Amino acid sequence: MLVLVLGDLHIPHRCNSLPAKFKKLLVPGKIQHILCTGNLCTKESYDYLKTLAGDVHIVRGDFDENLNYPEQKVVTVGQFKIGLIHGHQVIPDMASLALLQRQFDVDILISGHTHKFEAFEHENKFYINPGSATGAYNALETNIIPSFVLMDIQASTVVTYVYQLIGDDVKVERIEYKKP
């Protein structure tokens, strides 16, 4: 089943909208679950998510207005326990992320905060950062591309698709991970 992963949109303070071509791709009836790293940073974006899928999970980013969100959550999809944290908490760094994965005890750790996507396996655990769906600025960070992640999870397989707005086109990369 389809899981949309995104965050760090920073609407409306740093950006006003998802790129149009992202909005074109994202339509209701497809996605089963949305895991959101946070920094929406308002209700207007939260409602947008809820149009895409009923099952929305968000964690609290450092700039979110809605303060009822838990800072960290574990969600189970299929055979996968998934950790979710915005990531501003990581004092960095691959070592730090591995400490959270261990803390959580999950098969997949999702975090945000860097505004740059990642998807890789490390010690047989899987680590995803969808980057920033709007390509929002971040501190003085440099080459920032709008991105989001779609995972398809089925039994002990997840295949992860990263959608990137590069120049004016969407590029997709695919990473496979098997729960060992």
From Swiss-Prot:
Domain of life: Eukaryota
Tissue expression: Ubiquitous. Highly expressed in heart, lung, placenta, spleen, peripheral blood leukocytes, thymus, colon skeletal muscle, kidney and brain.
GO CC annotations on file: cytosol; early endosome; endosome; endosome membrane; intracellular membrane-bounded organelle; late endosome; retromer complex; retromer, cargo-selective complex
Residues reported to bind Zn(2+) 1: D8, H10, N39, H115
Keyword annotations of the record: Acetylation, Cytoplasm, Endosome, Host-virus interaction, Membrane, Metal-binding, Protein transport, Transport, Zinc
Consequence of changing Y163A: Impairs interaction with VPS35L
Record-linked PANTHER family: VACUOLAR SORTING PROTEIN VPS29 (PTHR11124)
The protein's name in its UniProt record: Vacuolar protein sorting-associated protein 29
Species in which this protein is naturally found: Homo sapiens
